[PDB]
Chain A
Amino acid sequence: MDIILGIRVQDSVILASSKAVTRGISVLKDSDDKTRQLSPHTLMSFAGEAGDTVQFAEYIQANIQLYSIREDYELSPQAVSSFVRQELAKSIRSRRPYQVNVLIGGYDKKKNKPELYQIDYLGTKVELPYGAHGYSGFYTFSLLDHHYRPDMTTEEGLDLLKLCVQELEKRMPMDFKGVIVKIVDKDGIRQVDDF
């Protein structure tokens, strides 16, 4: 639907995305990635407005991959978030507005520290311990601040996210049909297939 959730644990960014895409009266498909890999250690999730989301993904993706050819050097996650905020900021003033929210989760190798960035459509970046978007992001903020400790490893963090979805299934009326969860560990970018 719109549900993109983020939790940073001690050694990973975990971004999870809605399996479903509804346009029109029906649920057209129940599988469609709402993420594009930018770099080997940088991953971007996007949700929002029909049809803009795609064009504003692959426009970023090419541009950021252009830099990586030119200089043979994967940009910081710190850097990456700036490039997108700039592109958004510029686009609100224009003839077309771009309704798109982005979570950028990446692994800095300069700092060796995971970092997650949350950008809203307006054009405000904010680095967070965890974040969300839409009216959907509400149900999750309150489980997280109870059980989050700033030390968890990938397995304790993965179970925590399972609780969150479990809540989200009870209370929200829009379905979405589970999540694809993706992990940016110390190097890798792997899709866990379990819930």
Chain B
Amino acid sequence: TQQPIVTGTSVISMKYDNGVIIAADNLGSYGSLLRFNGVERLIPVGDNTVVGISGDISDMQHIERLLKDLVTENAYDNPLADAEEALEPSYIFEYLATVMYQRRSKMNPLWNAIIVAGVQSNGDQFLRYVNLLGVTYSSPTLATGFGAHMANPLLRKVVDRESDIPKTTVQVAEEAIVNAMRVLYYRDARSSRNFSLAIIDKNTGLTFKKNLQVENMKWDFAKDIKGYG
């Protein structure tokens, strides 16, 4: 049994026609006490995958180290495939999954959720989910922790089904997530103004915008609420 102590919470993601957009807040809470701030937890793994991790901070840093070495193992040899056979999304995922399997057998879990999000050497969009439970599922959009009940309905306007992925451009996606973030920053205690956004595009690599803050906030209406009767 592990007790979540220093937790950060919420990671959102969706597909569009040419890649994925994953973004998560950066914020390390410790119950009510907000004890650490601006804690990066969008990790690049090569230049065609980001792995976004949520739940317990302590457990996170021990899955930041296992990724880093996973590249050193692959990079050995394969000299005529140091960019051709370099770690696919699909590899990075399975490996994590099956470690998270193995600690749940001893009932001492790495108490987290993981999103693996990247692009194949076919160009196929990729987006999967794994967590403490040992469930996996892939999806047209994806949310973690508290954004399963707020963030998911917003993105499911844009992506409904598999007819809509070629119609959804990357200007539209961009708008959608930022805006999605507005609602999380409102209704979630454990969420701040700082958020890191990553685009993995299948045609231009890893675009990593860091330390955007929320924009256009409605608080004028609030003057006019008075008492409660």
Check whether chain A touches chain B (CB < 8 angstroms).
Answer: no
**Residues of A that sit less than 8 Å from B by CB:** none
